[PDB]
Structure 1
Amino acid sequence: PLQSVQVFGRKKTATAVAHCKRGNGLIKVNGRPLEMIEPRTLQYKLLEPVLLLGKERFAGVDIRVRVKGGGHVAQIYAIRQSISKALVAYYQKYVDEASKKEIKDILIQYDRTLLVADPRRCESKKFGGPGARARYQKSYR
């Protein structure tokens, strides 16, 4: 009986699912404040959706994220994609579509990966080489 959208952001095998519910501007990742998610070197990444749209658009809603898989950098990117997709889906289902458009296009005109997932994945290893493309050293004499 509450306004709630669960939207998932992704990066490599890191999945971050953001529960966006009607609230008072509480953003937390795995039960931690958004400013306490390491590494702080990529913190502005996590703060991108909030910084571009401002606090007022996040004021009337509370977001909780559950993140699994991947590594530290992929987890950060997926988390920032979820918060972006959630403030878009929440504004889409409950708020009108008109306002939902500006929060979307502003995010896209800044960074497309905030909304659209990155399709890249680890290419498979092929025998006769250490990795996907590199081959072992060839000796002739």
Structure 2
Amino acid sequence: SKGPLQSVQVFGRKKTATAVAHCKRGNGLIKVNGRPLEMIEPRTLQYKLLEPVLLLGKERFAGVDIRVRVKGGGHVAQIYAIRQSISKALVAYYQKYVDEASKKEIKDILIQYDRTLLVADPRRCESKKFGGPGARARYQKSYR
């Protein structure tokens, strides 16, 4: 109720788009780059941003206060980085400050809904080759 220094800072990133959630004890609220996640630009993906808080409910968030800083990538990758960073930050704060026995009954929900919530996508990109336009596609070759 008045514990100081009760804070973590956990990142989750996808495709060169880093997202660090600075989590701390406080009243239940969410802000990313200073604005609420509801006021996000891809409202077609706003459901995915509110998806983590819906998985384990607003009750488990009502005792915490988190602010996220995001840089790099595109809009979609930033959304994925934000949501997985939120999940990782909350579970890390939980296991740091309260019992992990109660942590398991939410970590299993997170992983069972989507492994990407806590496991960042390892695939990043592929290098271009000097035989074609892309990494694998080659140029039109002709025999006539």
Query: Contact 1:21–1:61 at 8 Å: present in 2 too?
Result: yes
Q: Deviations over 1:81-113 (max 9, x none)?
A: 011001100101001101111111101000000
Give how far 1:15 is off: 0.5
1:24-35 aligned at under 5 Å gives the runs 24-35=27-38
Q: Deviations over 1:11-65 (max 9, x none)?
A: 1111100001001111100000011122100111111110100000001000000
Gaps of 5+ in 1: none
TM-score, normalization by structure 2: 0.96
Instruction: Name the structure 2 match of 1:125.
Output: 128
SS of the residue 1:137 aligns to: coil
- Select which of 96, 120, 137 maps to 2:140: 137
CA distance in 2, matches of 1:110, 1:120: 20
Give how far 1:122 is off: 1.0
CA distance in 1, matches of 2:40, 2:10: 20
CA distance in 1, matches of 2:10, 2:74: 20
Give how far 1:138 is off: 0.9
In angstroms, what is the RMSD of aligned CA positions?
A: 0.7
SS of the residue 2:48 aligns to: helix
Gaps of 5+ in 2: none
Question: Once the two structures are aligned, what percentage of the paired residues are identical?
Answer: 100
Answer 1 or 2: which has greater helix percent. 1
The number of aligned residues is 141
CA distance in 2, matches of 1:3, 1:100: 17
CA distance in 2, matches of 1:87, 1:103: 10
